[PDB]
Amino acid sequence: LDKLLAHCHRRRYTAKSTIIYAGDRCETLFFIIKGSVTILIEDDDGREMIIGYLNSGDFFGELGLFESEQERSAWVRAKVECEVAEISYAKFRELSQQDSEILYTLGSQMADRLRKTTRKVGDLAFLDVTGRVARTLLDLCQQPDAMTHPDGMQIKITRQEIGRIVGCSREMVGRVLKSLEEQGLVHVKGKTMVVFG
Amino acid sequence: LDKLLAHCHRRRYTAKSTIIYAGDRCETLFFIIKGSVTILIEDDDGREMIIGYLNSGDFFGELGLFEKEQERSAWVRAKVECEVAEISYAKFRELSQQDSEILYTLGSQMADRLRKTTRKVGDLAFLDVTGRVARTLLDLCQQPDAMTHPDGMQIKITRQEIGRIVGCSREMVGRVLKSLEEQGLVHVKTMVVFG
Ligand SMILES: Nc1ncnc2c1ncn2[C@@H]1O[C@@H]2COP(=O)(O)O[C@H]2[C@H]1O
Ligand SMILES: Nc1ncnc2c1ncn2[C@@H]1O[C@@H]2COP(=O)(O)O[C@H]2[C@H]1O
Ligand SMILES: [Au+]
Ligand SMILES: [Au+]
Ligand SMILES: [Au+]
Ligand SMILES: [Au+]
Ligand SMILES: [Au+]
Ligand SMILES: [Au+]
Ligand SMILES: [Au+]
Ligand SMILES: [Au+]
Ligand SMILES: [Au+]
Ligand SMILES: [Cl-]
Ligand SMILES: [Cl-]
Ligand SMILES: [Cl-]
Ligand SMILES: [Cl-]
Ligand SMILES: [Cl-]
DSSP states (O other), X not given: OOOOOSOXXXXXXXXXXXXXXXXXXXXXXXEEEEXXXXXXXXXXXXXXXXXXXXXXXXXXXXXXXXXXXXXXXXXXXXXXXXXXXXXXXXXXXXXXXXXXHHHHHHHHHHHHHHHHHHHHHHHHXXXXXXXXHHHHHHHHHHSTTOEEETXXXXXXXXXXXXXXXXXXXXXXXXXXXXXXXXXXXXXXXXXXXXXXX | OOSTTTTSSEEEEOTTOEXXXXXXXXXXXXXXXXXXXXXXXXXXXXXXXXXXXXXXXXXXXXXXXXXXXXXXXXXXXXXXXXXXXXXXXXHHHHHHTTOTHHHHHHHHHHHHHHHHHHHHHHHHTTOOHHHHHHHHHHHHHSSTTOEEETTEEEEOOOHHHHHHHHTOOHHHHHHHHHHHHHTTSEEOOOXXXXX
């Protein structure tokens, strides 16, 4: 792409700070310069559930950019310290009209997200929670922010976070993770988990 | 006007005909002039699941349009007889470069699908198959094509059709439905959801 636009109103969010609130009416779009964010929605009873993560180089807040406008579709919460660049929907359109290559980057990312989100539907329907938990570990293993470990990879995730990803409570995800430990797949630490392999 | 050769290149598919096979590597996208299509995924044994539906005016086959490739990520099956226009990635790409509003239209449709697919995750999550079968009954109750009933709502559905919605077998749906008639929700050709 060519998103080297000087003007971008870059701001900083410390870990766990909420950047976007689902249901908000905002005509603004974001670009992650550094850090990562968590995408969250509410499930059947209003329980918060994690749909996925976005990283440096990803856009977010974009679903409303293509127009009667609509409300934000999810919460965007900084997972680590984030530096983001904010751009109005209107200003971004004038850049896209001047160079559509910024839209192809955006379009490429929604296709990627649609694919993963489509796959999440298949995982929830075809895998049980234990298989659902196992895929999550090997999924975030390969995804960014994982540290290569002497015995495999180290990822930053909690038993509570897996519960919101796979659709399970913390205690039951903890029992699955305890079983997976003697099965030799993982080792749970304070704020991290080490996937062996 | 749609686009340049929006209707220079039609193709008609009859109901139940597969238009796109998941895993295929092709670089062309489609536009539904008439009819509707079903988006489906499969598990390892061939278990057969509906992700959503698209209708006249929708593009599909677009997820590969942004590569510099990939395989189709899902099956696209004509639900009724479809009239579709076939467009090369190059033609759409050598025409959107001239007017990006046609890109906005596609993007608007990808945004709606991501939102719809995201919501589907939230509803499907935290429930097991039994809850999903029960949910499906209440979701088809509200459907516009449903039917009001003296004792509740009447809906036209098969065990196979429920199995394609929730991602389960016809046999597993039957016992779950058998329990609900005994568990005080239902009476199953047609179905009547009591409420
Ligand atoms: N299923 C998903 N996968 C990845 N990102 C998403 C998903 N759903 C929503 N988002 C992002 O979360 C944002 C919430 O607000 P917006 O709808 O403005 O834009 C949204 C996307 O950037
Ligand atoms: N979750 C979804 N919701 C709506 N449409 C989809 C979904 N997943 C895939 N598709 C469409 O199905 C098509 C299958 O082939 P493509 O990947 O080329 O492009 C895809 C999209 O047009
Ligand atoms: Au910038
Ligand atoms: Au806002
Ligand atoms: Au890995
Ligand atoms: Au569970
Ligand atoms: Au023509
Ligand atoms: Au094809
Ligand atoms: Au081809
Ligand atoms: Au109902
Ligand atoms: Au099943
Ligand atoms: Cl459990
Ligand atoms: Cl691993
Ligand atoms: Cl469950
Ligand atoms: Cl109803
Ligand atoms: Cl099953």
